[PDB]
RNA sequence: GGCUGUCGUCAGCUCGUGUUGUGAAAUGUUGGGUUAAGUCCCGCAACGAGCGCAACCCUUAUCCUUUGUUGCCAGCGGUCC
């Protein structure tokens, strides 16, 4: 199947959904460093 | 209806108020009404965003809202696009100049209200209530709660005879006034009926 | 072909630090070693540090 | 003379406000009267706590409105105006009155 | 022990910023010691207020541009980092700058409170060119010492602030240039005494006798560890 | 669901690990003392923990510092007392 652009990032908790919107992808501007998330882009059954 | 409300008993000591303004007997009721309205609106809007505490504070004919939320990104959206939108509606609701601030909630597993909400959501999407409760308790413990209790009640597993079940872990002193007991509640509007979720989270004792 | 095409443009602002490389126009290479305070600099009698 | 009536529900907050006001006064002008505490209004409410019936079941709440009377004896040019730009903390209704 | 003690005899102000100060009388050989010690302390460790967080409305990041202005937003943040403020009572204040209309935006256009004093009424910040353009920034002025930069103040800040507040580096020290001279003192019975002529150059916000008093207290309380304990 | 009364503001109710019993279960939590109190001591196949029993809070009873009007008048001057 195809991969997906959603914030509903798995295993990883309330440390994924943060510098992004409710539909995924980094929300612009911000003081991002290393280990952050910019574009939620993960598939089920991968 | 045995127990006193844990927030309510502690407002003078360890817990603060949400609405934080002065008004004379003339304008007080109106203010309260406004607060109720705005809060209601906010809840409606930011349901998908994990929101814990709306703190209203109005000085000098201008309303200052402070939204405590776990994920600011979904409440803010694009930088100053969603917040701005919210603001004008808030102002309209009030009838004064509005100002929205957004506090970022560190550790949403330790915030009680948020946990409750999560539990409710889980219930709605047809999980085993017990497993959800366990998760709630465990997570909080992991995060560094001195203790947590959660309680769920009524039509559990769609059963005809309603009952309440509750899981405690650590220590949750309610009679002790100086204990920081974050209490809050929620309601799962399931197919069989409502399921009320209470949760107490003991952060620790304050010394003063 | 390509489906999801999201390009994100970061902008780091790098200052200067022990280990960078500076040079004049004459071939005088250098790795900036110590970032001294203002006080420890050699000041002339007018008062300005170098 | 400028009489100033501070009113608030939180006492600590009120105290803080009063101090601030004094500070504002004292740098610009001279001879601030002082932060005089008036009587607190303890407006009491009883309510039935049952949804339906149980009359002896009751909660008794109250709102403690605190009063802080600050007076300024000499209004100068610099002093009075300083307050216009100097707003106090929220939840503290101030009430200045010259003469 | 035939020593003496010095006093601040004459304090001349050459201007509002550049101002010398004498010290009299110093003992033989002490002049370069006190002068170099007061130089190191007066250049390292003085408290002065500076710009820390700038909040412009309708902005995303500091590398954007704005409607109706000349300087870009990095230029505005640099010109705000050069600002010289002098608060009296509080240690953390919030100013306001609101201005519309064609013409430059001086520092004298900030709607001051009572206890803040902006000592440079010709400090330029913006050059508003459109008459339909506006700018409403809200500055935050802390108070400290030394140099604390944006990288270290990226996680150090505890008070969870909201997103949209541009972080400006903090140049806290209001002393920029200091030189001392050991002349020959004019003592009517002694010839082996000297004076110390400290020539400060401030940010305009610090009072030189107050600066010298604070540097002297810093040196004395540092030497108390040698005096009391061993 | 929420909220409420109730036994009853009654000293009780429990859990973990360990132990005994085929087991339902028991121990802990019982026993000498003690207390308002499963309050505290001592022993004891129990060891620990939590909710509760207490305390933290409000009010009130004594004192101090601060600050004194629209509050007070001890000492002072005036007086229409």
CB count, 10 Å around CB of E152?
12
C9 CA to F75 C1' in angstroms comes to 83
Q: What count of CB pairs under 8 Å joins B to D?
A: 24
* Residue D28, helix vs strand vs coil: helix
Residue pair B149/B140 in contact (Cβ under 8 Å)? The answer is no
Minimum CA–C1' distance nucleotide for B168: F50
b/e map of E182-202 (b: 16 or more CB within 10 Å)? beebeeeeeeebbbbbbbbbb
Preferred mutation among B65, B69, B79, B111 to probe E, highest tally of E CBs within 10 A: B79
- At which residue do the structure tokens 């700038």 appear? E54
Residues C10 and C17: their CA atoms lie apart, in Å, by 21
Whether chain E has a CB inside 8 Å of the CB on D28: the answer is yes
Residue pair A8/A23 in contact (Cβ under 8 Å)? The answer is no
Residues C41 and C23: their CA atoms lie apart, in Å, by 20
In angstroms, the first-to-last Cα distance of chain C is 59
Residues E142 and E55: their CA atoms lie apart, in Å, by 14
Residues of E in contact with A29 (CB under 8 A): 60-61, 163-164
Both tokens of C17, joined, read: 């630090």
Residue pair C19/C32 in contact (Cβ under 8 Å)? The answer is yes
Residues B52 and B66: their CA atoms lie apart, in Å, by 11
Residue pair A31/E156 in contact (Cβ under 8 Å)? The answer is no
Beta strands in chain D (DSSP E): 2-8, 32-37, 41-48, 58-72, 92-93, 96-98
* Residues paired with residue B182 on neighbouring β-strands, in sequence order: B201
Residues B203 and E79: their CA atoms lie apart, in Å, by 45
* Residue C10, helix vs strand vs coil: coil
* Residues paired with residue D43 on neighbouring β-strands, in sequence order: D63
Residue pair B75/B39 in contact (Cβ under 8 Å)? The answer is no
Q: Among positive and negative, which fits the CA dihedral B6, B12, B13, B18?
A: positive
Residues E77 and E75: their CA atoms lie apart, in Å, by 5
Say if residue B33 is preceded by a cis peptide, omega within 30 of 0. Answer: no
* Residue D26, helix vs strand vs coil: helix
Residue pair B67/B33 in contact (Cβ under 8 Å)? The answer is no
β-bridge pairing D2-8 and D58-72: antiparallel
Residue pair E51/E96 in contact (Cβ under 8 Å)? The answer is no
E197 CA to F72 C1' in angstroms comes to 60
Both tokens of A10, joined, read: 């798995």
β-bridge pairing B63-69 and D32-37: unpaired
Residue pair B7/B112 in contact (Cβ under 8 Å)? The answer is no
CB count, 10 Å around CB of B188?
24
CB count, 10 Å around CB of E226?
8
Beta strands in chain C (DSSP E): 21-23, 29-31
φ/ψ (deg, to 5) at B21: -150, 160
8-state DSSP, D16: H
**Are E199 and C47 an interchain contact pair (Cβ–Cβ within 8 Å)?**
yes
β-bridge pairing E134-144 and E48-56: antiparallel
Residue pair B119/B153 in contact (Cβ under 8 Å)? The answer is no
Residues B144 and B141: their CA atoms lie apart, in Å, by 5
Three-state SS letters, A1-46: CCCCCCCCCCCCCCCCCCCECCCCCECCCCCCCCCCCCCCCCCCCC
Q: Resolution, in Å, please?
A: 3.7
Preferred mutation among C3, C6, C12 to probe A, highest tally of A CBs within 10 A: C6
- Residue E227 exposure: Cα atoms within 13 Å on the Cβ side: 6
Both tokens of B34, joined, read: 């406004």
Residues E18 and E33: their CA atoms lie apart, in Å, by 23
Residues E115 and E93: their CA atoms lie apart, in Å, by 9
Both tokens of C32, joined, read: 């900036």
Distance (Å) of CA B90 to CA B38, B45, B87, E122: 6, 11, 5, 40
Residues E211 and E177: their CA atoms lie apart, in Å, by 13
Residue pair B119/B197 in contact (Cβ under 8 Å)? The answer is yes
Read out DSSP for chain B? --PPPHHHHTTTTTSPPSS-----TTTHHHHHHHHHHHHHHHHHHTSSS-EEEEEEE--SS-EEEEEEES-HHHHHTTTTTHHHHHHHHHHHHHTS-EEEEEEE-S-TTT-HHHHHHHHHHHHHTT--HHHHHHHHHHHHHHHT-SEEEEEEESSGGG-SS--EEEEEEE---SS-TTEEEEEEEEEEE-SS-EEEEEEEEEEEE---
Residues of B in contact with D60 (CB under 8 A): none
* Residue D23, helix vs strand vs coil: helix
E strand or H helix at D22: helix D11-28
Residue pair C31/C21 in contact (Cβ under 8 Å)? The answer is yes
Q: Tell the burial category of E35 from Cβ atoms under 10 Å away from its Cβ (0-12, 13-18, 19+).
A: buried
b/e map of B75-98 (b: 16 or more CB within 10 Å)? bbbebbebbeebbeebbebbeeeb
Q: Tell the burial category of C9 from Cβ atoms under 10 Å away from its Cβ (0-12, 13-18, 19+).
A: exposed
Counting runs of H as helices and runs of E as strands, what totals does chain C give?
0, 2
Both tokens of B46, joined, read: 């930011």
Give every CB contact of residue E144 below 8 A, 6+ residues apart in sequence. E47, E170, E172
Residues D23 and E174: their CA atoms lie apart, in Å, by 25
Distance (Å) of CA D60 to CA B9, D43, D46, D63, D90: 12, 11, 4, 11, 27
Both tokens of A9, joined, read: 């990032």
Touching B (3+ Cβ pairs <8 A), the chains are: A, D, E
Residues E67 and E58: their CA atoms lie apart, in Å, by 10
* Residues paired with residue B121 on neighbouring β-strands, in sequence order: none
Q: Tell the burial category of E72 from Cβ atoms under 10 Å away from its Cβ (0-12, 13-18, 19+).
A: middle
Q: Contacts from B113-116 at CB under 8 Å and sequence distance 24+?
A: B113/B52, B113/B53, B113/B182, B113/B184, B113/B186, B113/B199, B114/B50, B114/B52, B114/B70, B115/B139, B115/B140, B115/B150, B115/B199, B115/B201, B116/B150, B116/B184, B116/B185, B116/B186, B116/B197, B116/B198, B116/B199
- The alpha carbon of A29 is separated from its chain's Cα centroid by a whole number of angstroms, namely 16
8-state DSSP, D30: S
β-bridge pairing B98-104 and B63-69: parallel
Instruction: Locate the chain B residue with the closest alpha carbon to E165.
Output: B79
Read out DSSP for chain E? ------B------SSSSEEEE--B-B-TTHHHHHHHHHHHHHHHS--EEEEEEEEESS-SSTTS--TT-SS-HHHHHHHHHT--EEESS-SSEE--EEEESSEEEEGGGB---SSEEE--TT-EEEEE--TT-EEEEEEEEEEE-SEE-TTGGGTS--S-PPTT-EEPPEE---EEEEEEEE-----SS-SS-B-EEEEEEE-SSS-HHHHHHHHHHHHHHHHHHHHT--
β-bridge pairing B164-170 and E124-128: unpaired
- The alpha carbon of E82 is separated from its chain's Cα centroid by a whole number of angstroms, namely 10
8-state DSSP, C43: B
User: Please, do chains B and C touch (3+ CB pairs < 8 Å)?
Assistant: no
Residues B111 and E30: their CA atoms lie apart, in Å, by 63
Distance (Å) of CA B70 to CA B49, B76, B188, C29, D38: 8, 12, 21, 51, 43
Q: Solved how?
A: cryo-EM
Of E125, E122, E133, residue with least CA distance to E100: E133
* Residues paired with residue E158 on neighbouring β-strands, in sequence order: none
E strand or H helix at D82: helix D77-85
Q: Tell the burial category of E124 from Cβ atoms under 10 Å away from its Cβ (0-12, 13-18, 19+).
A: middle
Of B113, B116, B108, B135, residue with least CA distance to B188: B116
Q: Which of B73, B79, B108 sits opposite A20 (nearest CB)?
A: B73
Residues A18 and A27: their CA atoms lie apart, in Å, by 9
- At which residue do the structure tokens 């400028």 appear? D2
Distance (Å) of CA C50 to CA C30, C39, C46, E197: 17, 10, 11, 22
* Residue D65, helix vs strand vs coil: strand
Q: Tell the burial category of B17 from Cβ atoms under 10 Å away from its Cβ (0-12, 13-18, 19+).
A: middle
Give every CB contact of residue C9 below 8 A, 6+ residues apart in sequence. none
* Residue D79, helix vs strand vs coil: helix
φ/ψ (deg, to 5) at C36: -65, 160
b/e map of E168-177 (b: 16 or more CB within 10 Å)? bbbbbbbbbb
């Amino acid at each position: 199947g195809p991969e997906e652009i959603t914030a509903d990032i798995p295993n990883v908790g309330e440390a994924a959904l943060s510098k992004l919107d409710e539909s995924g992808i980094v929300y612009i501007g911000a003081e991002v460093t290393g280990g952050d998330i910019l574009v939620g882009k993960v598939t089920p059954k991968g | 209806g045995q127990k006193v409300h844990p927030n309510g008993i502690r407002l003078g000591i360890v817990k603060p108020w949400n609405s934080t303004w002065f008004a004379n007997t003339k304008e007080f009721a109106d203010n309260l009404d406004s607060d109720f309205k705005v809060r209601q609106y906010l809840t409606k809007e930011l349901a998908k965003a994990s929101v814990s505490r709306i703190v209203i504070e109005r000085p000098a004919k201008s309303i200052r809202v402070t939204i405590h939320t776990a994920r600011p990104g979904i409440v803010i959206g694009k930088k100053g696009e969603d917040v701005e939108k919210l603001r004008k509606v808030v102002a309209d609701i009030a009838g004064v100049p509005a100002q929205i601030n957004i506090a970022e909630v560190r550790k949403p597993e330790l915030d009680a209200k948020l946990v409750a909400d999560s539990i409710t959501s889980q219930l709605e999407r047809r999980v085993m209530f017990r497993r959800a409760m366990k998760r709630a308790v465990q997570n909080a413990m992991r995060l560094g709660a001195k203790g947590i209790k959660v309680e769920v009640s009524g039509r559990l597993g769609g059963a005809e005879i309603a009952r309440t079940e509750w899981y405690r872990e650590g220590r949750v002193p309610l009679h002790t006034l100086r204990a920081d007991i974050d209490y809050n509640t929620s309601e799962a509007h399931t197919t069989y009926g409502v399921i009320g979720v209470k949760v107490w989270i003991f952060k620790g004792e304050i010394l003063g | 072909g390509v489906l999801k095409i999201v390009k994100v443009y970061l902008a780091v602002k790098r200052r200067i630090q022990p280990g960078d490389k500076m040079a004049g126009r004459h071939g005088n290479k250098g790795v900036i070693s110590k970032i001294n305070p203002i006080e420890d600099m050699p000041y002339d009698e007018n008062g300005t540090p170098v | 003379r400028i009489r100033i009536r501070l009113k608030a529900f939180d006492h600590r907050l009120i105290d803080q406000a009063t101090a601030e006001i004094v500070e504002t006064a004292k740098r610009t002008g001279a001879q601030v009267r002082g932060p005089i505490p008036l009587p607190t209004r303890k407006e009491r409410f009883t309510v039935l706590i049952s949804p339906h019936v149980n009359k002896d079941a009751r909660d008794q709440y109250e709102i403690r409105t605190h009063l802080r009377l600050v007076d300024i004896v000499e209004p100068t040019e610099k002093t009075v105006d300083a307050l216009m730009r100097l707003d106090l903390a929220a939840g503290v209704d101030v009430q200045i009155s010259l003469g | 022990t035939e020593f003496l003690k010095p006093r601040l005899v004459d304090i001349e102000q050459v201007s509002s910023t550049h101002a010398k100060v004498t010290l009299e009388p110093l003992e033989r050989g002490f002049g370069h010691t006190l002068g170099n010690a007061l130089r190191r302390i007066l250049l390292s460790s003085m408290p002065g207020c500076a710009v820390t967080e700038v909040e412009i409305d309708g902005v995303l990041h500091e590398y954007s541009t704005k409607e109706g202005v000349q300087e870009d937003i990095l230029e505005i943040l640099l010109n705000l980092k050069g600002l010289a403020v002098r608060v009296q009572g509080k240690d953390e204040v919030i100013l306001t700058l609101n201005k519309s209309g064609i013409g430059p935006v001086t520092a004298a256009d900030i709607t001051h409170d009572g206890d803040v004093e902006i000592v440079k009424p010709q400090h330029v910040i913006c050059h508003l060119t459109d008459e339909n353009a506006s700018i409403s920034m809200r500055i935050k002025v802390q108070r400290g010492r030394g140099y604390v930069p944006a990288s270290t103040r990226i996680h150090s800040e505890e008070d969870e602030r909201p997103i949209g507040r541009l972080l400006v580096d903090a140049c806290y020290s209001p002393v920029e240039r200091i030189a001392y001279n050991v002349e020959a003192a004019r003592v009517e019975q002694r010839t082996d005494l000297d004076k110390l002529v400290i020539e400060m150059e401030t940010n305009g916000t610090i009072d030189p006798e107050e600066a010298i008093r604070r540097a002297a207290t810093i040196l004395a309380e540092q030497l108390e560890a040698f005096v009391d304990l061993r």
